[PDB]
């Protein structure tokens, strides 16, 4: 075990690489593309 | 998870700033939505792109390689260059940082050893080779019946990402052995296989799942079948035999149509 | 307005028929920070003497011309004190301001795709497994005139692919818009400006061995004279290094 | 010990499953993650970038850059210039950034953006009808029948391009990426509204086209893309 | 859980509003209970219909299909049309929204691969077909000894439910290839099977369990044996051989009796 | 590890059992669930609807 | 794990589709049938 | 019992894995650990000690 | 975990106390870092040596021994002296205190017994030997198919550490049977193997993982191939045959170069 | 079991020898070497 009307995110092998897919998603924006302009 | 935006209502509009006009030259995509063009209704839209994010898109554990045990021995140099379908998906991007979990699907039976041989040293070249006796080379013993072996390799870069494409060389200008592309840029190790029994079949399938992926510089998807690995060469030489010697095929996926305007 | 002025020290571009500037990936060139650094030695910043516009040779754009590419930093290797800093250092980084210039007339028709490709790894001109030679991927300021697809292109000497439709790498032109790009439509604009930061998975690398970027100008629609006797128009490329760094001072890697 | 049970699918190896596996090379320290420009977290951000439609794909022009542009001239009567049947599996869309992201997914929803740019001299002018025939309708073959669907009319001058939005019109909630008559998407066709008039009688003009996804576009059921095939081993 | 109501007491009643009279024509069922008809006692009634709800009724994981590995290869297009007993139970309803968990019962041994091939692409047509090498087609590797493979497919509609019955066509009026019924309305994918060994038997049984079911428009249960799948055709042609050609049997479940009033 | 045991019926496949299984197609988004008239949650609601008895069934 | 003189409803695969049968039942009425009348 | 699953790599023997194993010889008391001079907890402390380069290595 | 220190900035310096001068004679290593020599920038350095600590370095479970079942019987005296690669890694240190977990990898099948025979008593010399019936000798029964046996042996010293090197003798001056080195200093027991079936192959591989290690007095790494176990003898006698009798090879890893100053 | 936004260090066999690798590291210094001096 590693870390934590509930949920539990538990790492059995105690490595960050040994975890499954990373489902926690924040970063995004299309604008790096589709609008890559100064002004 | 992020749902796609709702469709907002829009009525008739008389506007002296057209949103449907623009310039393709500026290098920007259109901002136009259906609210600019037609007259729309409010639609409550719960659809998600969650299955299109780079984690789900590249996270399915494709087959990277196949090897055959010859005299109860096999060897594979870890890479995605050999399989066209997974190689095309990685090459939507210039740079990838990922851990990989490696599952070994074998039809053999009895007992197998996998040795992960880190770069820079010599691997066992046969079964019964003394190099299968290793203090520090990580190995896996498994019995193919009752379970598939799986291990995770973390990200071994030398850099902050893997190069999918590399426009440089590993040696200076005048060197005649120069190598072009990503092959010098990193080596992920090799997997050695041997059987400690005889038993079942000789086939060893290596399935690899990228996980914890970070992708960087989107590229045009591969428009042509691959020819060689670590190349980008798309010209295919079908035969060495005779007068068709030195005739090359591109082998693209574009299909024609009889007429424009009649489709 | 369509007017634009870009002053990078010692030199000034003035564009009176212009689009917005493409800022690649919404990212301006920065100096390598301390968080991202690898090598321990204090780098050199030449600033105004290296960072400035270097205009290359012009290329004649004609009926039937398939295109051109330049490799960066390569195209600048002989240019001013920027090119001197490439040979005397192990490593270097930089961003670039690429300004492409083609003007004709309101009677001329044509379109050019001006794109910047990170890590543009060419394909061998055809056949067996051969690395494209160092000599061919490093033309210098002259760049490479793309010739075209043929069965008759010489396959000797590890030559690069000549087919612009496949981007010389085996991927369709027309998807090249995924990279920082602008179109020069003679009806609309006579120029283009792209500000690319330093793109790499490495903080700095060898300026000579590795070509970070590639500037590719493809004639998307051919050049029609209209009613004029002008069947060709020049295309001039002008590059400014920006926020360029160099570290690992040594003997010049030149001959 | 603690009583447990092994339900069906416990000893399975599913290629698409999500699980934790033992780290080989424990203690390994990855190289530091620096800032790289361009980070892309979703592949639908590639489908939202404009890319040229090979609108001219025909016997002679495929394999050449000329497959991306069509010729327009001055004509006495309105003609149907171009037809873009709306299928993400059709070569027209399947080869683009939009269509080649959508060919990895079995079905899709949302709106398409198609942008037409005319490459001509500055003295050329024109009006064009760009119509979208909604699903279930017949390809018009007349400008009176084409104008009865979703359509724009783009004046040509002083701005290069114009954009028809193909709005989402569907009975069901998703459309199959591969063309079928049940989910079929309809047709985009190009017409002369008035005419293409050049400064000189025989003058001509070229039209390009790009497509991108709108922000409401969504895909599901990742599959193999027909856009890659491997007949040989790569060695 | 919901218990059935208790029986309430009722005595003799003289009433000028009969509850036992009514009109069958109005389209409504009777409200009559035994308290309206006879003289009753209080009965405390704990019985439940829990086993009759649509989740329990349709939730038993029936056999949908059988395939045989021919040259260590099999293929099955997912559907309930083939098996009469589960097809009859789904067809009590016009519309069904369900997830399905798929269990594969095989008498083979060694090693098997199942590929789920999403609609719209080409499947592997043989073992050793290169299409068994897939980046994004979800597959399952299992050894039939020690466990049965099981996976869940969520609801893939294109609509909010599956059509059990469809009174439309997929093409317009004048089209000669028109297809009638639910076959065009959705396709749930196909399962490809191959063996990576030889070993055991060739039989592959596909068991499917609907779960998370929502059923919509009750229909009369099927009164006749099925003839073809995706049809509703109940006329059965027993033989093509001879003078009995073009003789059809309905094959219903109604049984006669010698006399009314004597039963 | 933690001591466990595998009692009889652990490796069984029971057709009527209730269990959780891995999702193939992870991340898949089902089409939205709209209102449809007629929803029936129990099949005993069909038995409570009148239906004609074939009272005359004879040769 | 996913969610919650006790009880625990635990989802092992963290998907709503991967759960077993849905045993939580509220919605019902025969009257959509047997009495489908205006008044 | 409690439903479990055996993902790939469960019955594996990985040479580099970290796991707990049953003690043979239970109750065994190791000899006491005294102070010894020189304790080295990391092998990079040997690489940080100067050592002579065979600079003259030749035939 | 301990990250390596950051590189601090340094400018030009004029100093009358050189940090780059010193005395190799004092017996101390250099304190010089790049901030003393060149002009440096601040580098934020997150690298760790975690994989170099003695727990990770010696903690990989190397193969200590191989035995063959002859008549379904094998015997092995526990030690690291037999395998050169793990013997070299332990011998970076003079003293080691570790527990060891012992994994047995066998290609046999059916049923095997391992007996751990503590020092000081007699072991079973054959299968069917009555000494395989033991009250207090700890044994392990396992079936090689479905799992690898593993057990932990704690630290059995007689001392506070194991001697890797021992400069003493077990007997006094005049005794003619004196034994030199670590062999008398401790004995870790022996493992007896037998098969209760016939079945599979005869090979038994003993993998041992040091855990809870404490290492003491660093030594020069072994510069020469080993010749005998419990020796340190590096002189190798290649042949007993003839005139090359009494010719010895050192077998070191030093390689020459054509010229100094030309490398 | 033996002992203890979380973590749990659990010993299944209740012996200190039966535990896995010891990952808790404090003691160190190169100076026993590289600077083994009186003054």
Swiss-Prot record, chains A, G, J:
Lineage of the organism: Viruses, Riboviria, Orthornavirae, Pisuviricota, Pisoniviricetes
Main function: Lies on the inner surface of the capsid shell. After binding to the host receptor, the capsid undergoes conformational changes. Capsid protein VP4 is released, Capsid protein VP1 N-terminus is externalized, and together, they shape a pore in the host membrane through which the viral genome is translocated into the host cell cytoplasm.
Processing after translation: Myristoylation is required during RNA encapsidation and formation of the mature virus particle.
Name recorded for this polypeptide: Capsid protein VP4
Lipid tethering residues (N-myristoyl glycine): 1
Shown residues in whole-protein numbering: 2 to 59 of 2153
Subunit structure comment from the entry: Interacts (via C-terminus) with capsid protein VP1 (via C-terminus). Interacts with capsid protein VP3.
Organism, as annotated: Human rhinovirus C (strain C15) (HRV-C15)
Subcellular location: Virion
Curated annotation (Swiss-Prot), chains B, E, I:
Sequence intervals crossing the membrane: none
Domain of life: Viruses
Intracellular or extracellular location(s): Virion; Host cytoplasm
Assembly mode: Interacts with capsid protein VP0, and capsid protein VP3 to form heterotrimeric protomers. Five protomers subsequently associate to form pentamers which serve as building blocks for the capsid. Interacts with capsid protein VP2, capsid protein VP3 and capsid protein VP4 following cleavage of capsid protein VP0. Interacts (via C-terminus) with capsid protein VP4 (via C-terminus). Interacts with host CDHR3 (via N-terminus); this interaction occurs near each threefold vertex of the capsid and allows the virus attachment and entry into the host cell.
Function: Forms an icosahedral capsid of pseudo T=3 symmetry with capsid proteins VP2 and VP3. The capsid is 300 Angstroms in diameter, composed of 60 copies of each capsid protein and enclosing the viral positive strand RNA genome. Capsid protein VP1 mainly forms the vertices of the capsid. The VP1 C-termini form 60 dominant spike-like protrusions on the surface of the virion. Capsid protein VP1 interacts with host cell receptor CDHR3 to provide virion attachment to target host cells. This attachment induces virion internalization. Tyrosine kinases are probably involved in the entry process.
Name of this chain's protein: Capsid protein VP1
Source species: Human rhinovirus C (strain C15) (HRV-C15)
